[PDB]
Amino acid sequence: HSDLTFCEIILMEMESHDAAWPFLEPVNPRLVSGYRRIIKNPMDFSTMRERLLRGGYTSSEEFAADALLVFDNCQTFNEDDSEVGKAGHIMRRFFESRWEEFY
Ligand SMILES: CC(=O)N1CCN(c2ccc(NC(=N)N)cc2)CC1
Numbered sequence: 001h002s003d004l005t006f007c008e009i010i011l012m013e014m015e016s017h018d019a020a021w022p023f024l025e026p027v028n029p030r031l032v033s034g035y036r037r038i039i040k041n042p043m044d045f046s047t048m049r050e051r052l053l054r055g056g057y058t059s060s061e062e063f064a065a066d067a068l069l070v071f072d073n074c075q076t077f078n079e080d081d082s083e084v085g086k087a088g089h090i091m092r093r094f095f096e097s098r099w100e101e102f103y
């Protein structure tokens with residue numbers, strides 16, 4: 001239990017973060033040329049939200065794996081100096097620092 005309440009806090013905080021806009025909804029491969037081919041396990045904050053609300057996280061580590069998948073994917077598809085990439089670095093650093101001051 002106590003693991004999952006910290007997941008709620010950090011996901012709520014990532015959901016309302018300024019730099020969260022690229023990650024709130026699943027990427028739409030129809031709009032994003034080449035995303036289907038490059039990103040084999042897409043992940044986003046609303047899917048983590050859907051899974052967290054339904055209970056589908058056994059431990060905080062599974063939650064963290066999805067979080068890190070958001071930022072691993074962001075770095076695979078977007079150049080570091082791109083507008084989405086810059087947002088993603090800000091979000092990844094945010095997650096990592098928040099996660100470490102809980103564990
Ligand atoms: C999460 C991720 O990797 N995404 C890449 C594709 N997305 C995107 C949005 C806006 C621009 N820029 C523009 N002028 N339309 C480029 C790409 C957003 C999600």
Ligand SMILES: [Mg+2]
Nearest residue numbers: 068069071072
């Ligand atoms: Mg990693």
